[PDB]
Amino acid sequence: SLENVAFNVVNKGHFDGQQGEVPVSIINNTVYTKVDGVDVELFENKTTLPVNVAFELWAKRNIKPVPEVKILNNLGVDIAANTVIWDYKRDAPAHISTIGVCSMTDIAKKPTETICAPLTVFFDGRVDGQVDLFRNARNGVLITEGSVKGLQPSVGPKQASLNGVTLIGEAVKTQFNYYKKVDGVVQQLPETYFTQSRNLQEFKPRSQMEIDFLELAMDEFIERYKLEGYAFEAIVYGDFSHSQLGGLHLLIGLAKRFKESPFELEDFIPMDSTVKNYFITDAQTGSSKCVCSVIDLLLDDFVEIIKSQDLSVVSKVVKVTIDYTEISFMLWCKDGHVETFYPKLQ
Amino acid sequence: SLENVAFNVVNKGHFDGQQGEVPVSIINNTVYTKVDGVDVELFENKTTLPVNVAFELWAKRNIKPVPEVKILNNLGVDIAANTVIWDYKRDAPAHISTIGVCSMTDIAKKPTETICAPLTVFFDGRVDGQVDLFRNARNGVLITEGSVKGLQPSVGPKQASLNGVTLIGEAVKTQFNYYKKVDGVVQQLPETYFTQSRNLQEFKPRSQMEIDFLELAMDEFIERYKLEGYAFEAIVYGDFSHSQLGGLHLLIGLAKRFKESPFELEDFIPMDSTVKNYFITDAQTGSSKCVCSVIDLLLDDFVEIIKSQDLSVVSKVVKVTIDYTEISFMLWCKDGHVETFYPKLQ
Amino acid sequence: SLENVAFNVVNKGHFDGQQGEVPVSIINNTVYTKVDGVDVELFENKTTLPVNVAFELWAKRNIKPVPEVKILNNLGVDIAANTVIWDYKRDAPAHISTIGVCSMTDIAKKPTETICAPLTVFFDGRVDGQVDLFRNARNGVLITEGSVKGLQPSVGPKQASLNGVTLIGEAVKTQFNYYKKVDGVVQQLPETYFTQSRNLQEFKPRSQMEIDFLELAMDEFIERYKLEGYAFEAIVYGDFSHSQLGGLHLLIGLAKRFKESPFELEDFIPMDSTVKNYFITDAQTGSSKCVCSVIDLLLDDFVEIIKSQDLSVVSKVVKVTIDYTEISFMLWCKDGHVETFYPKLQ
Amino acid sequence: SLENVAFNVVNKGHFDGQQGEVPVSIINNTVYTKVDGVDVELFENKTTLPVNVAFELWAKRNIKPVPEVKILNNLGVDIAANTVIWDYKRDAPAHISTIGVCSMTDIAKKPTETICAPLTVFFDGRVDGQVDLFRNARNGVLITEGSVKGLQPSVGPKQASLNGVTLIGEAVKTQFNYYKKVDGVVQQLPETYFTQSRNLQEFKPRSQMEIDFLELAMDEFIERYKLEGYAFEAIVYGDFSHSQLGGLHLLIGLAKRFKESPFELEDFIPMDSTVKNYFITDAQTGSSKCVCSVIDLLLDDFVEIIKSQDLSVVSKVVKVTIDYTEISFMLWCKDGHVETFYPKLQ
Amino acid sequence: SLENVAFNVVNKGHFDGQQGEVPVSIINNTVYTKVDGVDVELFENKTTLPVNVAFELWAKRNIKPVPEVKILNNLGVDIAANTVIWDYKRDAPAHISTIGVCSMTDIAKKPTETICAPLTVFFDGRVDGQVDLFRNARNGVLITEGSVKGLQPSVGPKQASLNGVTLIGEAVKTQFNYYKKVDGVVQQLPETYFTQSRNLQEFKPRSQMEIDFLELAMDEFIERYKLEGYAFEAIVYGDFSHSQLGGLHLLIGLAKRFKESPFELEDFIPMDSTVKNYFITDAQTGSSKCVCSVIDLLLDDFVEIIKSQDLSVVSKVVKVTIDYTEISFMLWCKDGHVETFYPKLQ
């Protein structure tokens, strides 16, 4: 019930299944509740769904640490089992349909129904009975905080999403084991690098090499870590000398530049992806690139990736498994050294 | 509950207090329900209220014969006791607030609370206990289908409103006895004429004089009923010879003209009133008046009113009690005969 | 393209696949085009879809005679193959998804894809290759204007829908042969009666018994056709003597009453169904029923149905196959004669 | 002022320049006023303009007989001098800009400013000083009810538009003399036929030939008026024997067909033009044409036009001056008789 | 007038009663004005009121230092006398109705009318004649910057709200004397603590103990101020070791934590109250509580409150008068020391 959902929201901050109702008014894609005679905004609908439907899905969103939406997208997750994964990047539910959550968006009450068999259902082992549900599911992705009998685990990212806050858990567990079934057969998830899901204005180094990159100058870091011939001056640090911005394809380089000269990042596709494209405008020099592909990889991981390449090729597409998906990089080299390395197709 | 209100609407045509819910989507000031996977419109909000609030008030509207909104307005009714009077002219609730109906519009649960004491509460004797509630109310209007002990009744209009259909009841009782209390004192409602609440395109004569007016020509009807010197040719039949339309202040004359030449009536204040103002454009001659005051009185009643006037005055304002309210008419006369008679202030 | 769709609409009345564009402005769920410098409304979105999506689906609607939406719903049709069935009752597409029509609503380009296998796809034999597509479809409904090799046909209703106009075709063929496949197996469609899809204000008799019903009085028609003991006075003609309206469950009886006394029909679920529920208010007597189940059966067909019943039962649920679906009727009888016969569950 | 405009609307039906204000609430592209504590709708914005701007322009619309919008469009009128021409077909102002009417839409206060020199300003001689303004205007169209010194008049249509009602005036003058200036030079308006601006459901014959067409059968009318060899059976009466509707390009033929069999006319470009295109669906036969060009010419005028053609040509484009604009007709003939005659380019 | 209100807004920043008008366009719940031919946004309606009504109320808001909305709510203020109190937390007027401000929201022109007698009217002594109006008011709250003859004052908070900025005035007076009348009798306002209305990201200590709390560690501050046995480690500093966040019920503790580790505060009821509830998510540890009751009391005041309690009780509800209202705290103790102290009912 709309009024019951609003009662739960005003009294517990989210839907907890408590009984009770409050007066609700809907207007301008917004849900208001009346507190002491004055209307108070509870929810502004930013989705393509009806306002009441979006309000109910947002109230019933998972408030426990959940995998980032990019991870679920790369795993082909189409729907979640008896929960709502809220996409905080889009301010919308991460999946079109639900299973036993909202009457307007449900396609089934339980993930065992025939409509969910072709779909890759997301299962959370922390909920009782979902491991068995995944065991009997034709297609599904399972996350657990521990081991599963007879199933080889895939270690996921250290970080997870908690109410829209991406963090590495200390008081809560955010590292999950990932399991995937396709057509009833348990798959072996590929060995992968993971993006760190960091922010430009709140960048924090997670390794010694990243610390050195942030504090040391360009030449000192390049010489210290034996990174001559890999075009780190352009790929990571970025070139701001021409009207068209060069390189700057790692979030750590953008953060280092932002520390000295705050610039502009236009996120013209505001969603959660392994590779993010930005319309970057440098506020100090005026160098700008309309499509700048940025990936937030650990600098140690990116150094390993670039050093594992074969430099004796002019043009070559590099396939790297990042966040359980294959990211294709363009590798331009000359005279046995790198001239360019960015995610292709920007 | 919104969903429960919609369940009642889809299963019973209105709110009947039945338990159950249906999937509901709200968009574009419209309430949709999902029937077999496709959204079906249940209600389009034409009010100034929030869409869900208006939907709930419309579902809980009185489906029994109720007094016309103009009658309640003339009696000073500000609010109804535990019911919603729906104004079908405005497609909106007839009163801003409610008593024990909708959480968003309620000012009280029962009419006995202190907030309802200054307000003139509408009481329906057909509902059990409302006669006693009116007896203890400081201000109120009571309607009954029978007598009330110790209270002198006022006979109201023969017709009432049934789901937006104004009719004189045959299988149901539409004539009510009216009682009014002001500051705890029972008032004597004035003797009044009543408008017939008829429509232009569905006009039906309710008296022999009206039949004669509709069939007989102007001169024959005027001579037959001894109506010489009262300007019936202009006041009732209307003058379509000049660019500015003359007279035509009785609905029966407009209906007679519409039978021969269908014309235009712009209702620029679409509400329920004893006197209606129209922007009339005659489609045959081009005569038009931007403000034409029309009252739907019984022709026999209007003849009595015009013949009860004193013709030996040049200009005089005539006060007639119509629908429990005082309607002021302008009476222009010359040489002991009427030149004009219309509701004043148009 | 939105602009190309609008170009086709302004130049051909619907989408015909012609190249060209016109200036388009979208506002207030409405599509406007500019003709000679002034904006002209092309489409008002009454659906739950985005305005541009609904505009494109409406432009690409089938303009050939198509089965009524109620027939497709009773056959379990979930989606149409490479066409849009427009539901003119709801002013919306009859199906949520499309196959190769609109990028925003498509789930597949051709009905042969895996996503369409569980769905009952609607196939039109008048389109080249759709008979073969239906032959290879797991679930589907096929309509043809002629015979299909090896497939036993089911004769459908005489009438079809042509641009929202239900008619029995003379210059065009509106009677179709119906074929159904469930899980790859051709089904035998049950022998059924068909509703006539007539309107109250435009009722036309399609049989001699209907003509007699319309012209003859109650007693004369009942005695002429040997209809004593089947409660035709209540079930068909209707009882307007009490406050609660009695019977009136056939559209022909409502039309006969409307001819003498125009009344009110509130269609509180405005969709296309075999059985329609109305909030009926009789304008002459005041008799009203909030839920009146009305079915537009041929009077000869209804007489056969009521005479095929076993009168020696007090209460019995009658299952009649109407419009390829099972309609359940309540049959109350006493002393070997009918007291009541209406669609159950109103 | 918005509130002053609403005061004028509620007290006079339109803007009359009276002082005073009323409480106004704007919501959902609708202007509401509060009468006795309840909001009453004054105006629903159907234009592309802001709701308050459209409300002000609608209140200040010309309430005197004005030329039909199609006539002003054919004369190239871009703007009106100190008045608003309301297009009742579109429920919008006929011109984008105004001169001294509304602050949001004004481009000038008087038509003498430099911005109005390239524009063809509409002048009304019935307003004092507008004849002199037109005399000094570079581009303009003048209408008068009488003669103008030194200017040769062009006799316009007998009918005009009065508050959205097209009529031939009896108590008011609706026939105007038309004058046009282009680049400061008085033009000679071409001799033209005029459309009658009649409606399908309210068709009234304006000539003896039209009366005969309506009452007499096809063969009798064709033989009586010597109309053999001009394909009147198809062009005017229409062919309903095939799936594609044939002919029916005169409003009188559509009205004659509508008298016997009411059909469907989808006006997919709802504006005012000399030639109207309809998506016609015949409800009796099923014959339908998505683009049917219909012109409402006097039948005597159309007979003269078709008889003034040279029948000894296979294909020929006929240019007819109708409503001060050149309408191009396609004329297909064989063996010295007409096979087809419709407005070209439908 | 809407246009006059907009003129005042564009020329003075708010309504000052100046004459003049500017072109105004209303669309999408937004008021635009035209400056040099381009529309400029003046106001975005975030209220439940009509856009023009909300715009007028916002323009006429009090721009002088006014009591915080929480204070007026705790005093039972229902309406303000001839002024608008704008609630900047909700971006809406603090009261539903007005007295002599806006025609659409006024219930009276002066606070002396009968409709305002049951309501607690807010009076501002800084406006001439409002002290006398409060003297004759049945129910009211009066604020003055000085003494009132014969009335015992209540010293209010040091801070007030100035155009949405809460500050302790230096060039202006923000400390008011408060007076309350209920049913015509002057009340004695209870002795109370006052919240400091500080922000998390702009926290500034207002006492020496607060400075020590911010700079000193947990153990040093607890030992210095003799705060052993009152569970300051949990109640104020907060526990971030478990998945469920513990304590953290004082804004100073949240600010201290935010200084070291910026976290998330979801204000799911965005209004002004003495006790605020937040959905807190700690970005460093992952500890989160969906309902965290936070009160911004002076740390010296909270120490006095917690030390004035009787520790020899297991469970006890503590009633503290804060901001002229009774705040109920839960006090759990064991072995003569505090285990928990938070506002109850979160």
Numbering used by the authors:
A (entry chain E), B (entry chain C), C (entry chain B), D (entry chain A), E (entry chain F): 1 to 346
Give the published text.
Remarkable stealth activities exhibited by coronaviruses are facilitated by a series of non-structural proteins (Nsps), such as Nsp15, which is a uridine-specific endoribonuclease that mediates evasion of host detection of viral double-stranded RNA (dsRNA). Nsp15 limits the abundance and length of poly(U) within the negative strand RNA 5ʹ-extension by trimming down the initially synthesized poly(U) lead sequence to the optimal length that can suppress dsRNA formation but still serves as a template for poly(A) tail of the positive strand genome of the coronaviruses. Nsp15 C-terminal domain (CTD) belongs to a family of endoribonuclease with two conserved catalytic histidine residues (H234 and H249), which serve as general acid and general base, respectively, to attack the 3ʹ-phosphate of the target uridine. Cryogenic electron microscopy (cryoEM) revealed Nsp15 hexamer structures at 2.3–3.3 Å resolution at various functional states, including RNA-free and two dsRNA-bound states.
SARS-CoV-2 Nsp8, a previously hypothesized cofactor of the Nsp15, was also added to facilitate the Nsp15-RNA interaction. CryoEM imaging shows that an equimolar ratio of Nsp15:RNA resulted in mostly apo-Nsp15 (and data set 1 in Fig. S2) and that an excess amount of RNA with the Nsp15:RNA ratio of 1:10 yielded a complex with the available RNA binding sites within the functional oligomer of Nsp15 occupied by RNA (data sets 2 and 3 in Fig. S2). Multiclass ab initio 3D reconstruction showed that 37% of the particles belong to RNA-free apo-Nsp15, and 39% belong to Nsp15 in complex with obvious dsRNA. The apo-Nsp15 was reconstructed as a homohexamer with D3 symmetry and refined to 2.3 Å resolution. The hexamer forms a barrel-like architecture with a central channel, which consists of a head-to-head stack of two trimers (defined as top and bottom). Comparison of subunit A structures in its RNA-bound form and its apo-form showed an r.m.s.d. of 0.388 Å, indicating that the binding of RNA does not induce significant global conformational changes to Nsp15 protomer. Superimposition of the apo-Nsp15 and RNA-bound subunit A structures showed that the C-terminal end glutamine residue clashes with the flipped uracil base. In the RNA-bound structure, the 344KLQ346 patch swung away from the active site pocket, allowing the substrate uracil base to fit into the pocket.
